[PDB]
């Protein structure tokens, strides 16, 4: 972590399961585990998503990765970083004062003191040129931004974002609304079938409580998708 611009020590990742140092450089990031290290061109980061966990304790960061990270016979297109929602870090950027000027001043702070997730967002945001995708205007029956459901056998939570479906966590799944031909409903509980464009078939999230049906319909159609049953 010598000439790191900045290092985030001992971060808990759930995909891939482990604890990593995140060392950030100008054009790449290195994740540094006890057993594995991966290097990461900033430009491999396609999306940054910042979400609360429907759990009310943690807050997630999720980075979409293309090409995907390797370890080794498995491919990870998503890294999932978990933090305590309220955990904080003070960090000074390790930049010579003048190198901070000729470049990073516009995009980064010299000194941060915020919730760990917001400091890491900001730093990645500013170097990658990405906009952090966050919870939008969706809200469930009990004012949440995710519904409990399943994808295959995997029990989880569906985040209806302003431009995408986002499922957590057993596998993580990101489906942009532009990739959606239409959404179907069908059989307590119901099924949400997300039909892809371009003959890529359809992803079904089963077991959503009927109570959330109405609010999910009004939302998706407020997003101007085609909805039926």
Swiss-Prot record:
What superkingdom does the record give? Eukaryota
State its location(s).
Nucleus; Chromosome
Q: Which family does it belong to?
A: Belongs to the SSRP1 family.
Extra info from the record? Answer: In contrast to the orthologous protein in animals and plants, this protein does not contain a HMG box DNA-binding domain. This function may instead be provided by the HMG box of the associated NHP6A/NHP6B proteins in the FACT complex of yeast. Present with 22400 molecules/cell in log phase SD medium.
Subunit-level organization: Forms a stable heterodimer with SPT16. The SPT16-POB3 dimer weakly associates with multiple molecules of NHP6 (NHP6A or NHP6B) to form the FACT (yFACT or SNP) complex. The FACT complex interacts with the CK2 (casein kinase II) complex subunits CKA1, CKA2, CKB1 and CKB2 and the components of the transcription machinery CHD1, CTR9, PAF1 and CDC73. The FACT complex interacts with the PAF1 complex. SPT16 interacts with SAS3 and POL1. Interacts directly with RFA1.
Q: What does this protein do?
A: Component of the FACT complex, a general chromatin factor that acts to reorganize nucleosomes. The FACT complex is involved in multiple processes that require DNA as a template such as mRNA elongation, DNA replication and DNA repair. During transcription elongation the FACT complex acts as a histone chaperone that both destabilizes and restores nucleosomal structure.
What is the designated name of this protein?
FACT complex subunit POB3
- The source organism is Saccharomyces cerevisiae (strain ATCC 204508 / S288c)
Give the organism's phylogenetic lineage: Eukaryota, Fungi, Dikarya, Ascomycota, Saccharomycotina
Included stretch of the parent chain = 238 to 474 of 552
